[PDB]
# Entry
Amino acid sequence: PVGKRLQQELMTLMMSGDKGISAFPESDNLFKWVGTIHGAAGTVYEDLRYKLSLEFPSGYPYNAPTVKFLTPCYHPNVDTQGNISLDILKEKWSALYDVRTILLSIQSLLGEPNIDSPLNTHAAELWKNPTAFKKYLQETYSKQVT
# Structure
């Protein structure tokens, strides 16, 4: 029933047509997916894109999947390993959330960080100055495509 649910979740994702979100399982393993997120329009992450891995452990859906950024991401709530501090992925994970909900939540986090409990203190600090933030973000992102 778990593999079935994941297939149904992929179909839901495909027919929803949400902008800037995309993900599929690897051909040999339905329990490991790779996804892509684009920053939401109007945010400093607009026009930038990031790849993420999604792994569904044996305890899923009771236990949350492990989600990490594969593309380096400079952001208050992401660390050097691509780990993400997002409540719904940890303490507030619910077995009723689908892949679409997770992707949308992470896309939303890009534009609205939790700067009170950061993983990247420097980014949390610079966030107060958007122009300055945008600049460092683009600079750092830029060094991720050459």
In short: The radius of gyration is 16 Å.
